[PDB]
């Protein structure tokens with residue numbers, strides 16, 4: 001029997017996939033997770049006793065973003081190994097294609113939290129390889145189900161690209177993406193590229209956004225905004241065609257924005 005239900009903070013959440021928690025944890029009707037330190041527990045009693053004891057009220061690592069009650073914590077896999085393993089086991093409950101849970105040393109983890117008077121409540125995260133040969137600026141990205149489709153995933157996507165900008169590189173998410181990750185990236189790429197086209201070559205868009213050119217081109221192909229000429233993709237759009245796509249209904253939700261002013265992060 002596998003873990004199929006968890007209790008984290010004030011949420012109960014059904015699992016989507018097998019996650020390799022130890023055998024005795026899976027057997028339980030559900031797992032109980034501290035929302036701050038990510039310790040997983042077998043019983044409501046041990047969970048309740050932990051809530052009385054745990055002094056964590058936020059992720060470990062360094063708070064590299066804070067604007068109002070939105071916060072990002074950066075957590076090195078080698079410095080905080082238990083915590084990151086727990087994060088990975090939690091994430092594999094909702095990620096089919098994630099394969100790495102216990103070897104967390106090569107990754108850094110970016111934890112999105114919503115803060116209130118009692119603490120910084122975990123919303124989701126993305127991992128990132130410390131040195132990615134393939135140039136991927138996201139390895140796995142995961143919004144917990146109660147927070148999905150509410151702007152947090154978009155926030156985390158924008159954030160991964162703000163880091164890629166500060167590193168003076170382009171990046172792309174590691175593939176395959178979930179069905180919901182595909183739609184989220186496509187929607188984000190559209191948004192960003194359309195806004196820049198309204199406000200330019202494919203290389204310019206790439207440098208301005210840190211989106212790779214492949215991702216730009218394939219997004220413009222699906223928007224039908226690219227011509228082909230003698231082997232080169234070329235941007236073919238009129239200022240009104242862009243505005244037609246933008247003011248359409250599928251971009252009308254007000255984002256949680258990444259404010260670069262509030263991103264205290266230096267590239268190493």
Ligand SMILES: Cc1cc(-c2ccccn2)cc(C(=O)NNS(=O)(=O)c2ccccc2)c1F
Nearest residue numbers: 142143148149150151152153154178184187188
């Ligand atoms: C990258 C990503 C991944 C996942 C995910 C995948 C598997 C398991 C759990 N989570 C969820 C979201 C999410 O929640 N997307 N919705 S969104 O933030 O409102 C939004 C709106 C407009 C453009 C972009 C994003 C997401 F972005």
Ligand code: NA
Nearest residue numbers: 012013014145
């Ligand atoms: Na659920």
Ligand SMILES: [Zn+2]
Nearest residue numbers: 034037039054
């Ligand atoms: Zn705890």
